[PDB]
Amino acid sequence: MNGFERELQNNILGLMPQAILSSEHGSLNPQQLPETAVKLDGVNRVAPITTGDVVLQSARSVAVGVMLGIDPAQKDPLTPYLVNVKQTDLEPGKYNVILGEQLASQLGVNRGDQIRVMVPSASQFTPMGRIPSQRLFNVIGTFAANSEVDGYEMLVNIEDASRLMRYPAGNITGWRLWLDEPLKVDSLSQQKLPEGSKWQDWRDRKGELFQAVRMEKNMAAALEHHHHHH
Template identity: 45%
Template sequence: MQQLISLFIGFRYMRKNTIDKFGIFLSNLSTIGITIGVISLIVVTSVMNGFEKSLQSNTLIYMPHVILTSKSKIINYKIHPITEIQNIKGIHKIESIVFADVGLQSKTNIGSGVMIGIESSKNSLLLNKLIIGKPCDLINGSYNVYLGNKLAETLNIKYGDKIRIIIPNIIQLTPIGHIPNNRLFNVAGIFYTNSDSDSNELVVSQQDAIKMLHYPDNNITGWRLFLKNPLEVDKLSKQILPDGLIWTDWRERKGEYFYAIRMEKNIMGLLVSFIIFVAALNIITSLFLLVIEKQSEIAILKTLGLNKFQILIIFIIQGISFSFIGVLIGSILGVLLSNQLNLVIQFLGFLPKNVTLPILINYLDVLTIAFFTIIISIIATIYPSLRASSIKPIEFLSYE
């Protein structure tokens, strides 16, 4: 019953006519500050999540997530069969792969790329994006190659042309001296993925790649692992591997992009959080003013039997009310604004036409932002509430 009294008095103090005008101004300022802070955090988080998801779907999907290989970058698949690694957690699919950095030469230009030798054209994500050519032309011994459209433009080649693939770290002896191993390939297709793969990747038959790299029989670069969630590679890479195998993953080639986005997300979140911290300071100030104004009433309540904890609850409820309203309004407006952010930005003229920001609203992030905002507000109410609960009735009622 006594706890209900604390709640009743706490909710009664929430009424604006129980606080002076300056206290009302500070409480409103606290609520507005928390609302703006929550909206900003939700929008920033949604945009950063969108960028991260966009990079994952447009970049990581087309490149090897993980390659299990040896220190020499070559393994014997009979010594390390696929059954040896099938129990690794987080794997969606496993394929053999031959993988190497190569030089490229056309009739008019030179360049570089990453040669990926695959066993079959079936279910190849890159060959599913062909804009010219047929996947079925990927035949062992045909020495056909498929290029990204940007790489083809750089080398000034088109479908049906020939391109020379050079393996710089494998030297062969010829009548004219030592030269890198090389061979002419037929351009059997061009793919377009709208990702970095278009500018640096080329696909050949796995057996053709093995011959180019002079691998012994039954040898490949490694086992290619497709992960269910490529962004969990930090945790998955800590698993114990079979002896002789090492873990290499996409972080070696694209890790800096994702780390940059993650760091930017954290820094932006920290900067925007200062709005909430300022609002929390306003809560402290408004509660101090309320405590000063209600000193006599607090003293009377204590003489009527309310203890320190019950007085503490009264003012904590008062402080939480400022944040709860701000969090509720901010969460609703933050989600709505994130959903329509591209329309708002284009209306304001901040983005050119046909350019949109990737947006991904993670409702768990929204709940996390709301939860920690309320926690910060509760912490902000503790000190002024303790001051209120420590008031001695005799000091304030002696002159009444």
């Protein structure tokens, strides 16, 4: 594992959803596919997530982000990096948000401000037009992990997130996976899945980075092979 792979794994993949077991269609019902039914190879930990790409608007600016809707009672990899805010303040029905600190400074907000969160992928058809799902959230603080995720990730309560995603009540996006080897999602995606479930992973966010690490790795083995024959 070279420095490039190490950087990706320790400072990016360690702070975002490495993979998610979701429904084949729409959201996931945790009664139909509970956490116990998620036994998969290369996975050391499973947790519920609701996530989506969002547009954020404050009184000053606009930004783009990734909403991580989490069960606040469990530890997230971001949890240690919260700055003077408790994760358990992300109570369901309060529409609180903890922003990455660079995302917060891009929007010009801190604890006590509001931001408008919109989900372009989730809409209501009405006789006045298509209305994207949106809501004000209360910024209760920030996290600072010293990573690029500080510029785009945010934590909210999973249930708030699910309502924003317009999921059926009690559904979630799916089961977040932590992998022993997050760099081998290529192989790990091929395994046998529960039925009408599907595998998504970090390549959806960072398909230009998984291809650059793969190119480099094969250039390295090809030349080491050439060196070793001749």
